[model samples]
Target chain A: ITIKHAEGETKLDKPAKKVVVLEWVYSEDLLALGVQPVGMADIKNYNKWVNTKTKPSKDVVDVGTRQQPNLEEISRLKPDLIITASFRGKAIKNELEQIAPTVMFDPSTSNNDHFAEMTETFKQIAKAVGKEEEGKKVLADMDKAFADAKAKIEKADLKDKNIAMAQAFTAKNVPTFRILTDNSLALQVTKKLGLTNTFEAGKSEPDGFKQTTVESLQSVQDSNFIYIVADEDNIFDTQLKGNPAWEELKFKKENKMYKLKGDTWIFGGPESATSLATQVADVMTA
Target chain B: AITIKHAEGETKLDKPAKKVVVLEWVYSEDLLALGVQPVGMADIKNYNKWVNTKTKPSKDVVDVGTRQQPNLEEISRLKPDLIITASFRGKAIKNELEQIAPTVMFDPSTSNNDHFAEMTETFKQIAKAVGKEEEGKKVLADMDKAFADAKAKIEKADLKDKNIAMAQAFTAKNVPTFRILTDNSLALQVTKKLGLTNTFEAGKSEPDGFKQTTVESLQSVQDSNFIYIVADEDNIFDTQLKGNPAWEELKFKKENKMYKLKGDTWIFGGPESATSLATQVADVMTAKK
Candidate 1:
């Protein structure tokens, strides 16, 4: 059952000890799993994303950035286990193994869908750490949370409602905004509740965010609710009201505009997301 | 009194575990100390940086994508006898790892600034599993010596009266930011070891992350020695701070006690960083009146 990534066949006398990680999202997953990495990259960014509200331990050393790590530092840490994403490029893959046993998994093509891919990836890491049961529990928790929130929304009679999410930045002054697609995590959560996304005419990028303009709002002006996520620092609310054309929008006229905290919407987990869903449910019923 | 052990030469146990996977960095430290390599890991790119360039993991190790996704198929293929992870790995991953191999997750949060203790615990775990308890203890002793030697130099320097700040500006806004929590990583650990005063107390609601504040927040430590880390993009320090009126009002700025640190290495602040800070602080403060 031992899976090998590289071309060579190498055997170890025992299990691995030290491991290093690159991406912050993976770090969050690992931290949740109780696997304290020997070293990680872009830790500063991870620290910021977590919002300094739940500080991680200082001992988890920093190796380097996500794209480029300090090879010398890796050599010093002398890790026996290494893990990386398949998308981190082949050159990095070839170079990393020279220091420790390395593995790469492609998230894009691993499963039939993004959710399946994420679940499979989690299962894989759980197996590596010898915690398959824990992985299942984690996934179950996530599923249960999502289900509970959906039921609450349906009970509130907000099912099949039309919703729109946008990352409004005041500095960008562009009247239009991009739409969250079916593939995006935010959209996945919203879609789970049987709600319809308003920006259907837009296109989804390879990674999956949809680009759209403010004029696109005309297509779904009769929709029940509008949810806008904006950066706290940018001040998009001022711009939205300042625009004369925005007054013609149906949601604005009906006073159904709800602005959510950028961090909670953009980088939140099941708790924040479910809270958002509940808020939408209540707003729609009201 | 805390004796640690490492796995030594081969043993005559039941069939050797076909695969071995390490968890956090210390497993690598123990295995490397014992001279055994792992089969696969979480992130090779990061592994090389945290471990070493020359001793990078072999190509055979599979990239599990992220810490969240450990590549279960790959793990099953490797048929690891043991899997080691840290307490940071959430409960779900731990359950999955246990199903695949004999897994042990250690908690390092108990001891403040006691990396040695944590590393020692790891060595003990590996030694017991691999039947090399003596070797594990010897390795622990060796690591203790290495850390002690580094620590003694700083302790002997006696930097009691000195005060320092480790701050970085990640955003382009050039906002004045500082670390408020005691557990904010390398800078706090190193400064505490050096016996220097950290001006700002941990905020009551300090999040599990770093905080960005205004220059006014730094006013309390105006007289303290400052180590400023600015982004390497376009001489941001000069453009943002040097010409600013409020920045000029600080005592550290007036006395010229501020030292601009090299941008690249300041982000993580690891062992080398700890040493660098110690030497730099000694050099800079010793020369001052």
Candidate 2:
């Protein structure tokens, strides 16, 4: 089977079992398929940030940070294949290639959202692991998760179907809201669920988040503000304290603000996308 | 759990409310400072940009429409046990609100009531209403703490002799318009609390806390430190007044005592804004130094 990735196509004589993953979301995708990478980078923080409800087995060796992976440690793991993000992979391409067949993905590289990224990446990863059929099955399960979530939300009869999603937090004691753009995976989940993302249309960072200061938040003052942040670092509980412009914003003045607590993983895999839809749906309807 | 008599009427709660909805930022900030999330509010998005407080309205909060005309249908949907709103809006919609839940109303427009003082009273009332008196007790204390900290910072600053003048500047009729803030205004209330002096007064009386005058009035404030907010797109000082003799001759400009406050520092808001005002004032006051 052949898998088309950012760097190029990777051909596998058969499904591959030995895999190494650096990006946690891809690890989530692999776990959803009931396969584990032989090694993973930054596996320690996986559980805290990504709520895929699956973790690599105890035997999966650590390869280090995803960006600057301890190439030597990854080399020691000596897996059949290694998957890394585009920016990081290019820097160490020669070294990673010497160790194993490698594929690196430029996240959102195609302007395609989680649907395209997840399903296509899954098919590729599944081919790499020789579970091509299982990949299709889980992908099908994902389609239902989205459809079911959408139908349930339509039943809610919510006041504002229009919303602005953010992963709000603080930087240097100033309130910072990462306005979730339409290009965001979470919004893709939301779009599927029949909700509107009213954040202003504009340029976004590659990850589909536009970091907006409280001042810039005026761009979407009329839209309801829905956000996710850890309890310890919630933006509303920190830097935006007593901000006038923030207060005058439409959502802040009315009842259109919603907070999705715990871990809200917008970038993980299909299940993370599933969790995203469910969390947003529950906030809207419940 | 207790039943309490409120302005709207007698309300018997199953318990001190755990689910709440507030129709005004004043009461909303009160609930937020109580460290409790109201079930619904009036304008979440506007509150975000205007009130800019650390206290949050939770993401799951429902919108009951708006302040002038709330969405009664939406309020019914949230099924909140308690609803709080401003006196004016509340008075108009009380009958509809009472049908949905026990309602309490706060009058921010009472004659001679200081907005800050009124805010504190309503905040405590909300605390009592919600049965979260413990956190309510700390809200005012927290406000005082901000005042105290700001005062100390000002006392330590080197700009000791310069009185501060603040205004919102604009251009109309080919003249530079300046709304000079009065000492008694809510915006300047924070300035005074932080131990700073306002350089302008209404003369006869600036009932609304400001004197709307042209650049000619600025001559009186020439020696004082000038702090003005000019919108990026509407800066009259940089436009109509750029080459005006009076503007160029203002002593504050030549001596470098002038500081631009930019588009932040909302002078009118709740506790968070009061502190934000003090912070912005203290920062600008000391900036030239």
Candidate 3:
């Protein structure tokens, strides 16, 4: 069978086990399917960034950086197929081709439905390794999780209103808000749980995230603001601690804001999405 | 549910406690993990951020004052059926709390056993006192599942047997500080379960699970992979030590074996945070490069 990725087509003789992944979501997809890749990129930060229970086996080699994966290491692992993003894949296309067949994705280069697009990408990655059935199971489990989360959300008797997400951090003394849009995995999963996306950015941005100052947070003032901010330099706790504009927001005045862990990797596969769903559901109700 | 021996000796309860109050964050977290919310807790606002797990205390959970010195009047006003606390805090008001309701104060400190072992022991005792043995067992069983999952991932990694050193690193004043975890620390045991050897040897330990030392102490573990955590603003190595000769000269740093973890691991807490630390360490250690 032939698989079409962002690069070119590749014919597979059978399901491959000794796979290599160069991105977080793709690697996570393989783990969710219970398949440990022969080699992967950025293994060191998996726990801190992703924090999923589906851990890669120790046998998985860290080829190198995610952006510019060590092609020599991938070739050394003898991977039958190499999974990567187009940004990195295209640059080293000829070099990677010298080693093995490549399935590189540009990853919803421009799409409003980031979650659906990411889900499709995860399944595509699974198909490359001949784990389509397992991929379907991962998605199914996610659906089940969504159902459970929805039950709890309804049990709390919360209104069918809108919510927004942001990862607020301090940047050179100025508080920055990396707001998650409707295209993000968290918002994507929350949408399945019968919530509406309230974050409407000014224009298109990759991965559905847009940066804004707290001054412009007025756009989402009406929505329930679910955010992530480290206590050390939390924007809400520090700069905007007593700002009238920040305090006057409807969600703030009504005590409708929630802060989940900042490190919950929303740009991941089903596990991260499930985490998003459960965390938000539990907090919104609690 | 029944009489159970705890740090404050045997405290008998007639039935499952419906209205419990906790004097410490750890006990509050334990109660939440056991599917029970305390009628009141100390420093509810802090718990909302530090130990905020999937299941949290409801909005109605009253604040019983500070963890060190809880408000006795407020606690009595809550009409709690049980009062759970740490030995240090509970010993101060154990008699008063017992007069109001059944009291069981657990000593989370480790004297002869590992911190992790004592933590589970305390958790079980509290669970028994609260008539949630089965729920406690379920919680422990799930934690074991995490261990097994982490073990499976570690054993399959090529460097499963690699030597490593872990710390909750941050800046104290202008100098870099490291609270390198000892073998008996909860974080260390979790790392051991992942099939890796800890390189930090016990020299001088603080009363808490960590062995606090200055950055100069890190020179000893230079041969091992250095895993650490710091906030975005307080990352000393990236900030003050940006080009410091002492930090740059370390072998592990030179080899690019240093890994940054989440700053909110809160190792001094209960089951939920312990599991978070275990997953955080195991994931980073066995993570692919």
Candidate 4:
């Protein structure tokens, strides 16, 4: 089967029989669907974030680095389908497609959007593999999970609060941060729960994480509660809380700050979205 | 007509397009070729290496990070009508582009066959937005012979059975162990063409700074030749390998199969690197058993 993506043409000889995921969020979605990938990028990082449910299967190979994939090993694995995040580069897609049919999806969007896009990709893969019904079932189950989480959050009266989500990474004493915009899955799911995002300064570039100075914190300081997400090591958590400047913040003083489990916050999907909703509801009500 | 891409379908708007910003190299290549200079770009340092040097970006082109960190204020000041990114993964840039103008995400792979293919697609997309498609294709075809000739010369050389390792030495100590994975462009294409076997397997993720590996782990590479790629200033491999007794046992050293290619070609390869790689490999292996 041949699919024309953007301007290039990709030919898939077989549907995605064995797959490899490069990004954690995509892996989370694939795992939630019960279609485990053959290999994944950032397995160690994933283990640190949400190890309980999203640990990579032993059979799943680690493909070196996410930024750079191991084409030879991927070829050796002979996966029928290769799913990757679209925005990173077409170099991987172009190279991997030579080995197997490759599908690239945008990861910056919400889980529902990601799920919809993945469903489309899965349908294409399923049609090639003669597993169309299985793909449909996965999509339906994902929708059901999302609906259930949305209902729970709504019931918990999360609609009135202003929410702010940020990813903090500490290298040395400085904290590099990424504020979640409406484009993020975290924000999208939060919106579904009826919460309003207080970040209204238009949008920043390289949207996944925006760099901010210490002064920028004042903008979202009035938010009902600020959710901080970091790697499993809690490297950022220790750095931020330890900082005298961070401690001086109103949110920090009021004890409205909470840390999310590592990979679950960054890699979003049904698993992350639903689980996060439950956690947020518990925190907001408590 | 302005092309607006959405989840469901593309929306087209009939409006006069004016200001434009290009974040990816290929898109910048196209816009410049068509006489539409981008207001800003990510990583200005890489601009010189782009195939389309004739349309070298002006000083006005902003420097975003090498991977994908655009200067939001710079982009906002440019006030573009459309922002073209080479890939969709630069979500941060894409989101910022939305704020500046209607953003169009173009896949760089679409034009990966050659420089002209990339340039042509870039022109087509830019032209489609600004009503310049007819001229873009003609301009693209005009440059085909040069790219084709360069490609032919590169393909003519054969380095069959050569075992080459592409790596950067991150730290001074620890066996000079880092290896470039299959995903890197130079390693992937060059290794494939040379018919060379890469010593390292894919799926091993190395953390920042450097990955530490034991000498025993690298014993399998004793037979194959070594191509130690060092950055401009640091020769960590030489510091680590030279005068070390264990290094003499390696096939490259015993057979004199080692060569230090200039660091410039290794990290960021271009047409020059592609042409130079075969010659460098052949010269190093000459007079060796």
- Candidate 1 residue runs with Cα over 4 Å from true position: A1-17, A50-55, A105-107, A110-112, A170-178, A201-204, A212-220, A224-230, A265-286, B1-289
Better of 3 and 4 by TM-score: 3
Total residue pair clashes for candidate 2: 48
lDDT of 4 at A36: 72
Worst 10 residues of 1 chain A by lDDT: A1-10
> What are the per-residue Cα lDDT tens digits for candidate 4 across B1-289?
5675422235364674666766766566566666766666776674564333455778866665443345667778777777666443333234445776776665434433333233344456567776666756666455443334433443355444456555554442133544443322444344445455665544332221122332323444656667765542445555665544345355566766666665654333323334455555545545343
Clashes of each: 107, 48, 11, 16
Report lDDT (Cα) of residue A113, candidate 1. Answer: 30
Q: What DockQ score does model 2 reach against the true complex? A: 0.01
- Clash total of candidate 3: 11
Interface RMSD of each: 22.6, 22.5, 19.0, 15.7
lDDT of 1 by residue, A1-286 (tens): 2544322333444444566876554555565566677988867656654432334577878887655566679878888667665555233555677788776655355322344455565665566665667767777777777777677677766434777766554322444355555555565676786677666534443343444445455556666445454444445554555443365677778876666544444433333344556555555555
Best by TM-score: 2
Candidate 3 lDDT over A2-80, as tens digits, reads 7766656787787777788888888888888888889888787776667678788788888876644546668777778
Better of 2 and 4 by DockQ: 4
Give the DockQ ranking, best first: 4, 1, 3, 2
Q: Which residue segments of model 4 deviate by more than 4 Å?
A: A1-14, A50-55, A92-94, A108-132, A135-138, A153-160, A201-208, A232-234, A237-239, A242-245, B1-289
- After TM-score superposition, the amount by which residue B131's alpha carbon in candidate 2 deviates from its true location, in angstroms, is 58
Better of 1 and 2 by TM-score: 2
Global lDDT of model 3: 0.74
User: Model 4 Cα displacement at B190 (Å)?
Assistant: 37
Candidate 1: deviation at residue B62, Å? 62
Per-residue alpha-carbon lDDT of model 2 for A45-121, expressed as tens digits?
67777856766778898776664566677888878888876545654566778998888876665675545676677
What TM-score against the true chain A does chain A of each candidate get? Answer: 0.76, 0.92, 0.88, 0.78
